[PDB]
């Protein structure tokens, strides 16, 4: 579990969105595993606007933050899980690292701010859903 809280937005994995998220929906994209809902309180996270390929992510299944090198956001084939059939996931970045399903939502960040959140994994790989291209998170 986990979310990004920026301005009056809450960014969560679409497969973990609550009824309150769907009832206050701003934007959702199944192919990216992302959903954004509106909040009453203002959040403290800042989104990175960069092309960094090194950062640090939070792994709840180890209670640890790990430094990682990660690939550029791309269209990657992800195997079937309990939440999605086997399909291509877009805007996904991979790194070598530990990840279990419940690790989804952990933040990946760099020197500029939040880059994305854990969305995929298994077998010593961890995949992050990028949010750096969602410029509208910084306004309205
Ligand atoms: N985004 C997707 O297509 C799904 C979302 C839910 C989900 O459990 N995953 C994978 C399954 C394999 C292990 C694993 C480890 C860590 C995190 C996520 C996963 C991918
Ligand atoms: Zn950066």
């Amino acid at each position: 579990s986990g979310a990004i809280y920026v301005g009056n937005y809450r960014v969560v994995n679409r497969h973990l969105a609550t009824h309150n998220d769907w009832a206050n929906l701003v934007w959702e994209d199944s192919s990216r595993d992302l959903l954004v809902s509106s909040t009453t309180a203002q959040g403290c996270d800042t989104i990175a606007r960069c092309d960094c390929q090194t950062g640090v992510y939070y792994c709840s299944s180890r209670r640890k933050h790990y430094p990682v090198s990660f690939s550029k956001p791309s269209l990657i084939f992800v195997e079937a899980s309990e939440y999605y059939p086997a399909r291509y996931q877009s805007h996904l970045m991979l790194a070598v690292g530990h990840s279990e399903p419940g690790d989804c939502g952990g933040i990946l960040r760099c020197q500029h701010g939040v880059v994305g959140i854990v969305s995929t994994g298994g077998n010593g790989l961890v995949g992050f859903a990028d949010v750096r291209d969602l410029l509208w998170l910084d306004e309205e």
Side-chain angles (χ1 to χ4, degrees):
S1 71
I4 304 167
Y5 291 97
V6 50
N8 288 268
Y9 296 121
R10 164 167 141 100
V11 184
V12 288
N13 291 87
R14 192 185 184 274
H15 74 271
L16 299 178
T18 69
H19 167 78
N20 189 67
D21 291 319
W22 282 100
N24 293 283
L25 184 64
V26 168
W27 171 83
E28 56 85 20
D29 188 323
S30 176
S31 77
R32 298 179 66 145
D33 186 40
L34 288 180
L35 182 146
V36 178
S37 60
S38 57
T39 64
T40 52
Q42 283 185 282
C44 293
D45 295 319
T46 287
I47 306 300
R49 302 297 180 196
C50 68
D51 62 358
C52 285
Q53 284 191 249
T54 68
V56 169
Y57 81 104
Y58 181 63
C59 176
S60 65
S61 66
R62 295 284 183 270
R63 286 207 186 94
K64 268 220 69 120
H65 292 263
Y66 292 107
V68 289
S69 283
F70 55 86
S71 67
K72 294 200 180 198
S74 349
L75 192 58
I76 291 164
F77 195 71
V78 185
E79 292 297 295
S81 63
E82 300 286 22
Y83 298 97
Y84 291 105
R87 86 221 194 279
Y88 285 98
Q89 181 160 322
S90 65
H91 301 265
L92 185 63
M93 301 170 295
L94 295 181
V96 171
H98 181 78
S99 54
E100 296 173 25
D103 287 321
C104 288
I107 280 174
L108 167 68
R109 61 179 82 231
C110 63
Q111 68 187 94
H112 309 99
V114 178
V115 174
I117 50 171
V118 178
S119 174
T120 78
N123 289 317
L125 290 169
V126 57
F128 311 97
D130 185 46
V131 301
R132 293 177 292 187
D133 65 308
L134 301 178
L135 312 184
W136 52 267
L137 288 168
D138 298 338
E139 71 222 16
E140 162 94 287

